[PDB]
Amino acid sequence: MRVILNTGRTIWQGQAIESGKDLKMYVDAAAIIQMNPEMMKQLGIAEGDNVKVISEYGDVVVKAVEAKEPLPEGMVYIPMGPWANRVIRPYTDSTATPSFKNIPVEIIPTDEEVLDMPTLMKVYGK
Amino acid sequence: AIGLKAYPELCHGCGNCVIACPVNALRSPEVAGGKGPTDDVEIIMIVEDGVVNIKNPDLCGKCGTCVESCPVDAIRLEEL
Amino acid sequence: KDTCIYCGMCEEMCPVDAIEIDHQTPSSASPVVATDIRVDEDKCVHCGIC
Amino acid sequence: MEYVKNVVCPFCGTLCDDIICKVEGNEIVGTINACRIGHSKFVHAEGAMRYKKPLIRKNGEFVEVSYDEAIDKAAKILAESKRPLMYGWSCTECEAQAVGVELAEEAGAVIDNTASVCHGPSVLALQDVGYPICTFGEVKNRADVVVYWGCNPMHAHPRHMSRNVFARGFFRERGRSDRTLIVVDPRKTDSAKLADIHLQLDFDRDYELLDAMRACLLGHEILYDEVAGVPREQIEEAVEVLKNAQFGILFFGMGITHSRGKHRNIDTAIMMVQDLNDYAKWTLIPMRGHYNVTGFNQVCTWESGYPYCVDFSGGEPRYNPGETGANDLLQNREADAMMVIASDPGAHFPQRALERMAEIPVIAIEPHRTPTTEMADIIIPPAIVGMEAEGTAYRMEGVPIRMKKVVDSDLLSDREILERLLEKVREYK
Amino acid sequence: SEIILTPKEQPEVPLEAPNIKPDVFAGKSIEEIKNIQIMHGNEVVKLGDFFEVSGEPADAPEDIKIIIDGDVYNTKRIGQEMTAGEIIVRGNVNMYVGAGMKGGKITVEGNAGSWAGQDMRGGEIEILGDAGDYVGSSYRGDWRGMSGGTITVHGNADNEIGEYMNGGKIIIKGDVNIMPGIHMNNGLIIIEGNVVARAGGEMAGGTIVVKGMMQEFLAGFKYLGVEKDIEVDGEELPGAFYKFEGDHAIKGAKGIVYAAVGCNGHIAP
Amino acid sequence: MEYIIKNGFVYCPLNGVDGEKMDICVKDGKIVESVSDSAKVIDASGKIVMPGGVDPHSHIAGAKVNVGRMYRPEDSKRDAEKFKGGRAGSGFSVPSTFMTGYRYAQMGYTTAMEAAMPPLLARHTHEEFHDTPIIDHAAYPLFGNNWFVMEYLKEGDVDACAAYASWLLRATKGYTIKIVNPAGTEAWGWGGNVHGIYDPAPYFDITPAEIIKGLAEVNEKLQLPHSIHLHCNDLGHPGNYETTLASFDVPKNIKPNPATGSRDTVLYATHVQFHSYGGTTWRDFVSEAPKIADYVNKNDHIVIDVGQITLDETTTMTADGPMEYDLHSLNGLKWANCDVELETGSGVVPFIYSARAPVPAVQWAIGMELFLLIDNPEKVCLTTDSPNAGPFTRYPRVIAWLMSNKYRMNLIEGELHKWAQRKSTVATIDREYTFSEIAQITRATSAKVLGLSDTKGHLGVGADADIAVYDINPETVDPSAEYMAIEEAFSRAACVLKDGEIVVKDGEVVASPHGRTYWVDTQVDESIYSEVLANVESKFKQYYSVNFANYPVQDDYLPKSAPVKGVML
Amino acid sequence: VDAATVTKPFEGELIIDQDTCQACETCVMVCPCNVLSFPKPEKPGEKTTK
């Protein structure tokens, strides 16, 4: 399903980054995708099911979660972090600032696993 | 037996409730002005360790102002 | 606007919706059912119904 | 258990200076007044890595070294680079930031802070059209219309509303009840839940919406009967609310700096605020993110004349956001070395930038384990500002508040590390 | 007189070479040209470190024709502030090609980075490929932008082309992204392809013509009607155009936007 | 160390020296009787020796200055510099801090004062000072729109206001009581202003006149070295000369009582050019500078500085919030603003003073009238309200204008709009300043009025070794016909000593020591002081956005503190 | 037009301590008769009864 990806802060992601990016707390709070209940029905997923997110700029796997902050129709929300930054638009339009918000992506269910923090960074072949 | 009741696991520690409370405001000019108390004062609740923490519930008049100032239902008036 | 009692009949009957009234719920601090009335003379066609 | 009162919180740009720290045995074990985020930074969470000592990677596994050796390796990298990038700065104090500028001159580096992924667009906007602001106390004591445009303070500046909206002020003694609260956001945020008016506009259409508001303000009819998903009549009503304010404040954040148009969204927000002053007193404040992102832009500006994306490659300072920004040098593959201090670009830059950080030497002045330290070749743990070290920080509207040293640490401070690093870079030339 | 610069392998750390212009080459032998200063990161280097040099010299800039016989995708500021002569680049260029030039002609047979013709005062720039952002723009903070000259992009360009324009002419034969003519005060912009959004945003004056489709426009423009077969600054465009005046978010604004009737019916109120 | 400056023509007006061949002897930072003959000799033969220049009014450190720096990258691009041994910098009209210090020294200035410091933002001013080389300095806290000041004076409580000032001066490490548009900037907190000195701001119900007179009493009860520093109401308005004359009279019956120094005047009025306008609108606008000059001549309670228009593209930055908005509304250029809680306001707008334009042409003439029609140079200081009327790097051009009526006539008969002749008298004035009178208005008058003439503004024994040598031979050079030689020789000093150390040689900076921060230490009755400090902290808890404990400037920000004593118990 | 007539059950007095009131608006919301309200200042810098 083609949706609009919005990204940004949550109080839980804020608590997680100041505790430690290495903790499971961070994966549970930033490796997620908030969706409206009705969008989860049309796609056949429930809370806890994992989602494959593909864009023109990359791909990532995140855990689906009902949004306590309701979204407009067609929009999803992934909190700021390395998982969200797999798929958002990098180009800055000659301002230095990447397009972190409102990016067309494809979302589909997946039995694949969510990568933890050290493992996700391996995709960049350091 | 309606009284104040916190849900610290939902709370952002944002302080809206502490400031809005007329009892807290009457007792602390700092609170009245949107600040956390620095002077030692006895008020209904504060944010402690990052979450709302009821300290002197006997002073609560169950008016519901704090409840209406919280968007995440982390503080409520109900049966205890 | 002093004589006006804000009954709202002109506003309903204007055939071109040229009259607007700023309605409100009264309060002890503002004990009136409206704060203003205006005629948009760009819309008014001077039929005299009001 | 010593109680330390009047502590300045080192997280967000609200820069609360009323924190009370619970100190049990040279350790911070709890707080008062701090929000859930602020409390998290003051207190160590069990299991989380706090780097005790410097590190250097050899075979994908790090090896502990001394400060001198790690600083020597780092100074070697910077001194032989031809386009080195020194990025971050926003979560450390201003003296460390000032050494950084002198180091950037010495190394011929590009020095840039987190503004270039945050309110840099606001910086570009204000350079073109201006910057009409006030300090928090003015909002508290005068404001009767408060607007959060494209920000979610409940989640990103948690005590901001309690300190500025629910707070009772001299001419606003009824607190929340004396203020009209407006939130503009495509989502029903927890901030929008508290608002009197929620403009739930279409995403990426703020610029269009503000064009209609500005044109309506100057007496012009709105061409379209719906703009940004907002009906024409509702736009005119919103503009009337702003015109009737006795004192209006426009807070704004990433919803319009990151979204389509970027700096031009802020541009047009600023010009509306300016022109509102013919009808009502109006100002704006950008919701600066980190507790001292504003401080780096202050320091850099007054030392070099420019606020961020500053290139010293030619000796003279030169400035071109879109070229000399951190993401520009990485995505165009210009930079051959990256020094990261008090920031986590590994977590918070896009993949195209991360692709370049994997190809170049990366130095990280970082106390914790992050995605950046995973991409790093040297790690240098510092003392944490506002907990273990002091120095100036700047609140989001420019108020300088001195961070405080609550506990002692065997670790070096940012300022110390950079001062030694600077000395070694001079040498290697 | 033709002087050939043949690029060696371009470095990952870009070059800045504003001294590549007839004004500097004039009066100099082939060997002196090789010793010309360019920047390589935080290092000053010689032009001959990255270019072979040949041809015949000349005393006057009008008479020099610089040919860059290769791709210099990572060379910035070619032809900056040149006043006479000609530069032909048989390949791509990086940023600031022709920035601030007062005369002469520059031809880029490939693509150009952002700020092509920034602060142009006069002369011609012709880009046969695509361009980036800020074709013919101003510099940050300065409300006085391009004041003369002509720029032509045969391919596509991106954002904010013509930013703060105050004279001259920009022609994009392809498409542009958003905000062409932002803060435009004067001059003429022709886009023969499409615009995504925000044409004329906050313009105070000048003229913008879109021959393709504007996907979105702006509520601050007043609709003036239709004109057929119009001619702006010596440029004639047949067919009918919708005519708009704005941007009336700006005080006293006199800008004009023309949009071909064929592809913009949805834009009319 | 030891130094001796030989055979230079000395100009020191505080010690009656008018171009006398004379050697100056320096040791360990002071000017001394003599020295051993192993002293390093500086041949000033055929050259002019003056004291180090003392700028009483410049905008060089703090929040409003840095906004102008930040939001004008194009000003930086116009003028970016980097010389070996120095820090990088940029900014034509709003230079960066290192550049600021370098450029003051090059033209022979060793001391300059930051003119408008918001108290809550004091840490910012001092931090920029630390990155400002060579010059000694001080900052003026703003009082004329302060809520405590207005509340206390309206209560009739001058004593409590004096104790508040004592605390604020110490807490911000400030030096003078600066007054900018009294009451009007508070009125700008609601988008308004005041008009005249009898028009109060909302709620506070106290007139500008009461603020001026109340604050002039405070100043002398605290025995401060400087007087009140007044920027009058109605700046830049046709017909404001009447407001300005009434403002000057308000405190003239108060007697000056400085505890340190030789100040004998109770009112310092800054950039008076902007306050000398006749007419009623811009169309009947005329110069009233002769009436202002006449008042200055006939009265002995006032010192002024001019605020000369340099006729450049520059940046305006003042604590006069509403005036700056009005300026933006006139020229349309980018406008910055900052209302500071309980304390003050500010605003920043670029401005172009073209010589071809009528009003800037008259404004240029008004400043020239003030310089030349005020007989006694002991009452005037050379300024440009830097950068409001022009950057301080233009002071050598102002000097050249004053020493040469040929330079002036060149401008008047060429570029200058004809309104300079039609609406002013500048063209009928052929007076030319002398090297002594130039020395008076660039060093001596300011040093004395600031209370620093014991150590600054003079070359006599006992002063600090702040010395400038200019490559001008007064026996050879004609200042009237060779005005360009004057301007250039005053722009690039042959040699400059800062506390006995050479810091400039032939216009070039060769050393960058940090300068001193002068501030005012005063003592007040413990009982009053305690009562005020209890009320202040109580108000911080209620209305400030910061906790009282965090407000005062910590000593870390004054590495080189230089306290100056006022009243003592 | 003085067409409505009302009589009340109780007689009494209302007394408000403005300095104790912290303007939480509870009583305003509670009052079933719309007696109590928060006046808005007419002019900037003007203060009202709390």
Ligand SMILES: Nc1nc2c(c(=O)[nH]1)N[C@H]1C(S)=C(S)[C@@H](COP(=O)(O)OP(=O)(O)OC[C@H]3O[C@@H](n4cnc5c(=O)[nH]c(N)nc54)[C@H](O)[C@@H]3O)O[C@H]1N2
């Ligand atoms: N918890 C937490 N708090 C933090 C941080 C953190 O990492 N975590 N970091 C700090 C930093 S660095 C910063 S910069 C601040 C940022 O604080 P905010 O500025 O609040 O940043 P975001 O939450 O990313 O985005 C705010 C809102 O923009 C909205 N938005 C998205 N697209 C659009 C649009 O097109 N129009 C409009 N009007 N709105 C849109 C989103 O729905 C979102 O709710 O937070 C700071 N505080």
Ligand SMILES: Nc1nc2c(c(=O)[nH]1)N[C@H]1C(S)=C(S)[C@@H](COP(=O)(O)OP(=O)(O)OC[C@H]3O[C@@H](n4cnc5c(=O)[nH]c(N)nc54)[C@H](O)[C@@H]3O)O[C@H]1N2
């Ligand atoms: N998808 C998406 N991506 C985004 C955003 C978004 O909205 N969406 N927002 C962007 C924005 S606005 C920003 S600013 C960035 C976030 O910017 P970052 O700077 O990456 O945010 P943090 O993760 O808080 O990084 C601060 C780091 O400094 C460390 N630190 C804390 N105190 C100190 C100290 O005293 N000294 C030193 N040396 N280090 C210290 C912390 O442990 C932490 O790892 O994210 C950006 N990326």
Ligand code: SF4
């Ligand atoms: S309770 Fe609701 S309101 Fe009081 S703090 Fe926790 S969140 Fe903020």
Ligand code: SF4
């Ligand atoms: S209920 Fe009314 S009183 Fe009890 S706490 Fe919440 S607010 Fe203070």
Ligand code: SF4
């Ligand atoms: S005017 Fe219209 S509203 Fe007022 S009274 Fe007559 S009719 Fe009713």
Ligand code: SF4
């Ligand atoms: S005259 Fe006819 S039209 Fe004009 S207002 Fe009255 S009613 Fe409406």
Ligand code: SF4
């Ligand atoms: S708001 Fe920002 S600053 Fe104040 S506590 Fe919460 S986190 Fe720390």
Ligand code: SF4
């Ligand atoms: S408002 Fe009504 S209720 Fe709330 S405090 Fe004042 S009086 Fe008590």
Ligand SMILES: [K+]
């Ligand atoms: K922690």
Ligand SMILES: [Mg+2]
């Ligand atoms: Mg510009």
Ligand SMILES: [Mg+2]
């Ligand atoms: Mg600058």
Ligand SMILES: [Mg+2]
């Ligand atoms: Mg103020």
Ligand SMILES: [S]
């Ligand atoms: S940030």
Ligand SMILES: [W+6]
């Ligand atoms: W940020």
Ligand SMILES: [Zn+2]
């Ligand atoms: Zn002034």
Ligand SMILES: [Zn+2]
């Ligand atoms: Zn001034």
